[PDB]
Automatic annotation (TrEMBL), chain A:
Signal peptide: none
Transmembrane segment boundaries: none
Protein name: PWWP domain-containing protein
Principal subcellular localisation of the protein: nucleus
Species, as recorded: Trypanosoma brucei brucei (strain 927/4 GUTat10.1)
From TrEMBL, chain B:
Signal peptide positions on this chain: none
Species assigned in the record: Trypanosoma brucei brucei (strain 927/4 GUTat10.1)
Protein name: RNA polymerase-associated protein LEO1
Amino acid sequence: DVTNATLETTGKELTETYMEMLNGDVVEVSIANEERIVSLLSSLASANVTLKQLIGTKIGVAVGQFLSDGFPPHIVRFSKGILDYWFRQLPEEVQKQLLAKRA
Amino acid sequence: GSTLEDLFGPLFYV
């Protein structure tokens, strides 16, 4: 697994990068921020994250912000694949509760 | 208990 501290600082930087890019309602995507987003996310694309770390570090929430309308689909696909992987690794019945409460 | 939104944010879906 990954340490809580790595996930937590990465989550904080992701959220700060996200908030910086919002010009009011509109997402502004610089070359440098596009590249900073990829760098932060690709450190998490190799992490095995536990349910407890999802609860405590909020790393899934911080990655999920980049599924919003203003971000390039290259970044949105990356965020989606990272979260898909973490969700699938959860125990099957945990997947079922989170899903069933949602239907 | 935890919801999918608690863990993955309000935009994620399976």
